[PDB]
Copies of this chain bind each other. A is one copy, B any other.
Amino acid sequence: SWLPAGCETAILFPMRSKKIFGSVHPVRPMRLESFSACIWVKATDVLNKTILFSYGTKRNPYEIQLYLSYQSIVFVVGGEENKLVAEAMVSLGRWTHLCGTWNSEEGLTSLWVNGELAATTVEMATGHIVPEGGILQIGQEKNGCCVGGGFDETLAFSGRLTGFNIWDSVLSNEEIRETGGAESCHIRGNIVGWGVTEIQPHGGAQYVS
């Protein structure tokens, strides 16, 4: 069970279902004006839309998203209208490193894979800020589980995660390249870190340390 870096803490999603997902509980509020989020992934199968991590309040279920689709990756911020698609990036069955970015001052969006720029644009959700007090999850969208499940079966994820880090400010180009190193496990953000901030798996999600 090799892992990208010295990390020995990787969540495992055996098989998609309507009750499999992970939760995150940031210590500090999620009010963001410009955020950078990176995450490793070893996807097993990709459907029309597979969620890796998603943030959404009660009145807006797509405040933030980053999902795969066949051979493309999509980054959604602010709402369902905004998007950014990189083509022919992810290969099934191999580890890879994904990283986004955003800036509310000018609405500039970016997306990196394996430390090399893939797709970028400008004027995305300009003049917008993500409200605090929402709900964050990894591998699933924002849906209830108190009664009758609710998580659509096709949107779940199956594979491995690690190094899930969310900053709260724009990063540097060199730094985004560094986190993909072979011994970069000891680099963490200030909003959510790996192995520090609470992450509670549910419904079969299990650590594979």
A195 CB–B CB distance under 8 Å = yes
Nearest B residue to A200 via CB reads B147
Complex Cα gap A188–B93 (Å): 14
A65 close to B (CB within 8 Å): no
**Across the interface, which residues of B come within 8 angstroms of A15, CB to CB?**
195-199
The interface residues of chain A, by DSSP majority, are classed as: loop
Residues of A in contact (CB 8 Å), total 50
The number of times this chain is found in the oligomer is 4
Which of the segments A97-105, A138-146, A172-180 contacts the partner chain? A138-146
Which residues of B have CB within 8 Å of A188?
Answer: 45
Contacts of A186 in B (CB 8 A): 92-93
Write the residues of chain A forming the contact surface with B, with a CB cutoff of 8 angstroms. Answer: 6, 9, 12, 14-18, 23, 25, 27, 44-45, 58-59, 61, 92-93, 133-137, 142-150, 153, 158-159, 186, 188, 193, 195-200, 202, 204, 206-209
